[PDB]
């Protein structure tokens, strides 16, 4: 019945939203925040209020708006302005108070209660009492409480509760006992009175039921003395565990205040004060701390701070920093630390060793702030570098373990290096120069390496950033002995696992020209061979068939080394990736593209030296003799012609005729016509014609491509399904499918002429991004992720791609809906050309009109509407939407940071079972797509109209935008991890080829690309000088993605109107 109540809601919300579509009314708008609330969708509803504001300043008083927006701190100062300019107004005062009780402002709430007690109104007199009880409760003043309680009716949940508290102070336990049960039933029956349509009062019922059961433990804490530790444990544990915003915890602690004073609680309140800062209630956290100190809000500001409670001070000081006063904060830290080492070295008479160590750990966590703040106040320069390194090394000493400490020291050292490397690039723009630099860099490089190593070992599981950082210093430092020793030392020390994360990066430098670098890599890879062979074969196999000599050479040495312990795995994997390449582009398919390219160079460029270079491989390729039944049945129907077409071509090579060459082309065009006719008939491939060795395969030890990881039982290729569908396209990819040793099926896409290595590093970046979102509480709260897939490169040409199940391209879902509903597929298109035959040549102004014309004469639902018909129910429909909305905003932000262009309807798709969106085809990364010559993308990410429309109405205000800054928030915090990854494939040797494409050394370009990304992660992505905060930047971006002036300029294929 419970999951049956939400169905009626979900369904009525559909029609309610479909109603809003026809005309936005405050009538609907009311019934909308309500139904989105019963459905316990807090944010989607918050969106409905955002719209309610920007369209109807009609429920009026900007103070009533801030109050409904739970921005109490804004509404208070808005009510003051509304009271000081107006009069007494019994209504304005009630709100002025509701703000104070939400803010935990008992001092002012009690003053405002008593100093204004004419209150001729009786309802004003009735409400008054509920609040002034809690205010009096916070201020101690129990006489004031009972006075105001004796005015609260005993028929209310509130009136029954406040008695239980007054009884507990006055030690009336049986009274308190009964008052709880009666307050429960007055709340249980109240949860049926407004059965659905209530505030955060359904979620605040948890707050009242939590407190009531807690107040029954405060009861347990009065006469019979046994559970003090057991109660304090559950109190403490169900607090680190519990996540309730500031306000509730105040009251929650106020119950615990009846028994345990702050001075005994200590840790309890510091954890609370800690949250008040992190959430953003510093004025409250301060007061919490002042109380624990038993000393001034430091009204004596010039004086030193009380060392009586070392932890509390540290708290105060870090609160002072996050507060305004932060040269003042830094200053109190230098001294505090100095007072702390004294209170250690001297005060410690051995018999105190726990105090000694916790005093040493607090100090470490002090130093780490000291260095952190020094860098913040001063930046990086010849003065601060050895000072912060001082602070960090000092923090490294006092905790020995602790990731942050070692990490920070490594980064500082690594940035000490960068500071000078970048300072010397500054000098050389305008002998003893390099000598000092050598001594300068070797000075900071070695400790950095060391630091990153002991940082990694303390990170097991999550150390991608630091692991990559080791590799920068490693690869980047053409090895001077000192560096290499530390590197060798680390590799010895650090676990082998670490390196799996980083295998494609290691392999990208097998053929390192530097002699000392190479050796370690090779040795490391071979050890990664001894354990975890599998995470190596595929990538090493690819490397071993490389045109670049030193690569495939060095690659083989490792494979040889791996046969000494895993031979047939190397052997199987060898052949399996060999046959898959054969299957990817067949012999005739290689000729078809090869006869096209050859006729361009000759019959349109007069190039025969290049034309011979197109054909000669295709001839030499076949010269090796047919090896499959498909290769032979080709060899009969076409072979002899081609063999003699080369005959004429080599008569021209020596004769230098033009009639010799015309016989060859006579033969060539003949076979072309034959193949071309057979190509739309290529819709399937049988394994027994195309590659027999694969049909041959049974029960291999080779793991199913990109399914190997430790922790998980190896799933191996048990059998390859005999048929591959040929996806009809310009590259005819294959739908290869394998059978697993578990029993499950694993479907793949065998692509033929696409360098999958970029897609790989992206999927890597995504992996990282996924971890980051799994670790931010809110992002984990909302299930925020990116559906990724497996990417197994097979060569520079080909590779495998994981087939995401249950998915259709955005383009597919439309084409079906459009044909079902008898709508011409490209109708917006045909509309545009009918209006403006030369659309592509118009001025921006002219284009916008034509574009707007098309939108105004087509339906913008489609996606929205087919997703409704798709759904088997409506809570499934609603969830699939909530899923879609989020997953998209996730990929909007991340895509932007990556610079992910080319997001047309065939490059993204929808999971038809979760709704979650999924990106494929990661060709155009970084501005690339925008930078291009023909039809530059102005857009940052696709936020097309039918996308916007499939979300909830109030879309971009609701779930989307919120999810945008949540995601973007995470990114800007962990910007270094994100930059480690991206830096690791921009400056990657083999992958720089996608930036010299600005034509249709590179060091300079690669630098920009990376700056561009940093800008995006430090809010400098728009204006050069303003450092824009998240919500602004996000707003700016959504604007940019929505602008008609941007979308009309998009290549027509991108379907800027879908």
């Amino acid at each position: 019945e419970r999951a049956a109540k939400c169905r009626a809601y979900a369904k009525a919300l559909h029609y309610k939203e479909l109603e809003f579509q026809k005309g936005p009314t405050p009538a609907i708008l009311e019934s909308l925040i309500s139904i989105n609330n019963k459905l316990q969708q807090p944010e989607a509803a918050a969106g409905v209020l955002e719209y309610a504001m920007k369209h109807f300043g009609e429920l009026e008083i900007q103070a009533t708006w801030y109050e409904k927006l739970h921005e109490w701190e804004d509404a208070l100062v808005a009510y003051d302005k509304k009271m000081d300019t107006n009069k007494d107004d019994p209504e304005l005062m009630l709100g002025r108070m509701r703000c104070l009780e939400a803010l935990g402002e008992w001092g002012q709430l009690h003053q405002q209660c008593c100093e204004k007690w004419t209150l001729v109104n009786d309802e004003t007199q009735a409400k008054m009492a509920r609040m002034a009880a809690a205010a009096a409760w916070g201020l101690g003043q129990w006489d004031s409480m009972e006075e105001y309680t004796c005015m609260i009716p005993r028929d209310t949940h509130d009136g029954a509760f406040y008695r239980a508290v007054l009884a507990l102070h006055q030690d009336l336990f049986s009274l308190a006992q009964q008052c709880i049960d009666k307050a429960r039933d007055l709340l249980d029956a109240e949860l049926t009175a407004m059965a659905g349509e209530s505030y955060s009062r359904a979620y605040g019922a948890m707050v009242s039921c939590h407190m009531l059961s807690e107040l029954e433990e405060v009861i347990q804490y009065k006469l019979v003395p046994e559970r003090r530790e057991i109660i304090r444990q559950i109190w403490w544990e169900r607090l680190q565990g519990c996540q309730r915003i500031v306000e509730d915890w105040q009251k929650i602690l106020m119950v615990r205040s009846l028994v345990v004073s702050p001075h005994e609680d200590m840790r309890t309140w510091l954890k609370y004060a800690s949250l008040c800062g992190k959430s953003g209630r510093l004025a409250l956290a301060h007061k919490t701390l002042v109380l624990l100190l038993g000393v001034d809000p430091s009204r004596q500001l010039d004086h030193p701070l009380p060392t009586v409670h070392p932890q509390v001070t540290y708290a105060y000081m870090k609160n002072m920093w996050k507060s305004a006063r932060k040269i003042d904060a830094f200053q109190h830290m230098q001294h505090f630390v100095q007072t702390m080492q004294q209170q250690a070295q001297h005060a410690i008479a051995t018999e105190d060793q726990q105090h000694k160590q916790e005093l040493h750990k607090l100090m470490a966590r002090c130093f780490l702030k000291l260095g952190e703040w020094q860098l913040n106040l001063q930046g990086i320069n010849e003065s601060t570098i050895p000072k912060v390194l001082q602070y960090y090394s000092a923090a490294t000493e006092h905790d020995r373990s602790w990731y942050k400490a070692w990490h920070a020291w490594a980064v500082m050292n690594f940035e000490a290096v960068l500071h000078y490397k970048h300072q010397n690039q500054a000098r050389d723009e305008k002998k003893k120069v390099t000598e000092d630099l050598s001594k300068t860099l070797l000075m900071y490089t070695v400790p950095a390496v060391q630091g990153f190593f002991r940082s990694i070992s303390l990170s097991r599981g999550n150390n991608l950033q630091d692991t990559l950082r080791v590799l920068t210093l490693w690869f980047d430092y053409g090895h001077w002995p000192d560096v290499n020793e530390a590197l060798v030392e680390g590799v010895k020390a650090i676990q082998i696992d670490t390196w799996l994360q980083v295998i494609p990066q290691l392999i990208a430098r097998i053929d390192t020209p530097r002699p000392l670098v190479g050796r370690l890599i090779h040795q490391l890879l071979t050890d990664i061979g001894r354990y975890h062979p599998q995470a190596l074969i595929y990538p090493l196999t690819v490397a071993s068939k490389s045109t670049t000599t030193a690569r495939h050479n060095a690659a083989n040495k490792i494979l040889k080394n791996m046969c000494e312990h895993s031979n047939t795995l190397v052997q199987q994997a060898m052949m399996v990736s060999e046959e898959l390449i054969r299957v990817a582009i067949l012999w005739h398919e290689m000729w078809h593209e090869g006869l096209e390219e050859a006729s361009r160079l000759y019959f349109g460029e007069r190039n025969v030296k290049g034309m011979f270079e197109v054909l000669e491989p295709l001839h030499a390729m076949m010269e090796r003799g047919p090896q499959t039944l498909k290769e032979t049945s080709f060899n009969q129907a076409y072979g002899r012609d081609l063999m003699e077409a080369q005959e004429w071509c080599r008569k021209y090579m020596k004769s230098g005729n033009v009639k010799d060459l015309t016989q060859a082309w006579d033969l060539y065009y003949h076979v072309f016509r034959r193949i071309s006719k057979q190509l739309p008939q290529l819709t399937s491939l049988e394994l027994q014609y195309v590659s027999p060795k694969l049909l041959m395969c049974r029960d291999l030890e080779l793991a199913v491509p990109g399914t190997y990881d430790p922790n998980q039982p190896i799933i191996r290729i048990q059998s390859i399904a005999p048929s591959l569908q040929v996806i009809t396209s310009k590259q005819r990819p294959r739908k290869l499918t394998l059978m697993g040793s578990n029993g499950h099926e694993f479907v793949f896409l065998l692509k033929g002429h696409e360098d999958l290595r970029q897609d790989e590093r992206v999927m890597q970046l995504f992996g990282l991004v996924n971890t980051l979102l799994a670790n931010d509480p809110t992002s984990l709260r909302k299930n925020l992720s990116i559906q990724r897939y497996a990417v197994i490169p097979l060569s520079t040409n080909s590779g495998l791609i994981g087939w995401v199940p249950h998915c259709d391209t955005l383009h597919a879902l439309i084409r079906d809906y459009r044909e079902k509903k008898k709508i011409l597929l490209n109708i917006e298109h045909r509309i545009m050309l009918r209006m403006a035959p030369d659309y592509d040549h118009l001025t921006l102004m002219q284009k916008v009109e034509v574009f707007e014309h098309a939108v105004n004469n087509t339906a913008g639902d489609d996606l929205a509407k087919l997703l409704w018909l798709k759904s088997p129910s409506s809570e499934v429909w609603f969830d699939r939407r909530t899923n879609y909305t989020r997953s998209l905003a996730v990929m909007s932000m991340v895509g932007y940071i990556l610079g992910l262009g080319d997001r047309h309807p065939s490059n993204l798709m929808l999971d038809r079972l979760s709704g979650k969106i999924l990106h494929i085809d990661f060709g155009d990364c970084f501005e690339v797509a925008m930078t291009r010559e023909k039809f530059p993308e102005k857009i940052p990410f696709r936020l097309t109209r039918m996308l916007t429309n499939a979300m909830e109405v109030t879309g971009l205000d609701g779930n989307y935008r919120i999810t945008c800054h949540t995601v973007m928030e995470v990114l800007r915090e962990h910007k270094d991890s994100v930059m480690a990854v991206l830096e690791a494939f921009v400056y990657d040797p083999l992958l720089n080829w996608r930036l010299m494409d600005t034509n249709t050394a590179l060091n300079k370009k690669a630098i920009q690309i990376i700056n561009r990304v940093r800008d995006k992660l430090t809010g400098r992505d728009f204006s050069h000088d303003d450092t824009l905060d998240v919500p602004t930047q996000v707003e700016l971006l959504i604007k940019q993605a929505t602008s008609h002036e941007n979308l009309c300029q998009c290549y027509i294929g991108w379907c800027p109107f879908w």
Partner: protein, 317 residues
Amino acid sequence: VGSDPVILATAGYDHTVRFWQAHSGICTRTVQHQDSQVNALEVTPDRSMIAAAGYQHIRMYDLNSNNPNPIISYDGVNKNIASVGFHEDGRWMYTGGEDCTARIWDLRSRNLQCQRIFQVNAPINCVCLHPNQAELIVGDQSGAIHIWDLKTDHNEQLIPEPEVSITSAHIDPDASYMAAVNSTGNCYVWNLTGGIGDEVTQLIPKTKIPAHTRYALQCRFSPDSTLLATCSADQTCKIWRTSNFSLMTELSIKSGNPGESSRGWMWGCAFSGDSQYIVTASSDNLARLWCVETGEIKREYGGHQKAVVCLAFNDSV
């Protein structure tokens, strides 16, 4: 054609430039203009020939030889050429282009080359020449209005509100007022400090008219200097008094029901010599003749297959 006392020319996405007879609505001759739409039409002060600024060319047909094809074409300039303007004394032609360049063309010579180039960052939407013939006002897509002194080559610039693009500027016969119209839908007016001959020629901000909610597409002063016309994307041409800066007459094609989605933008306008009438170009395939005082549609020029974006209107003796 150009022999008639009135010249009225109309061009758009339908590959023709059609000439109309003002007083009737009959179309005299049509010319072929293929490969492009027409962005701006302007009849040379010499009444000899008309200029059709299009995509990467400015083809000029003849108003005398009453039949042939483009006398002159000007090529080798990439992206659209948006505004055309002439110098009274025969031989100068000014253009603004999407290629960020204001260009001066010598009409009495050869070369697809141009006598001068004025480079700005961001596309130029309009180019208009001060009556004194010595200064060119150039409004770009960034929202700057550059005044370029054709003598001193000294460039001076001015941004009003702009972060927003200025769509067209104009300056009245009597050189007392300058107008600029932007994509927000605002119309700026300035007072003209007549420097002229050892020139100061400075601008003093007078009013900002909230002309339109949608794009404002072109602004134009009446010969009179009495009125100011503001065409826009809200299917409207608004006519404002220069004494008052108040709305005098509104012309609109606003359909007649909220669920029509429009059909037609008010792309261009031109006043008659007496400033008694106004000609109107619209994306609904029709040029229109309006009576400025009543706002009565005194004629409708039907002929164009596709939309209209251009007008040229001429009264000279």
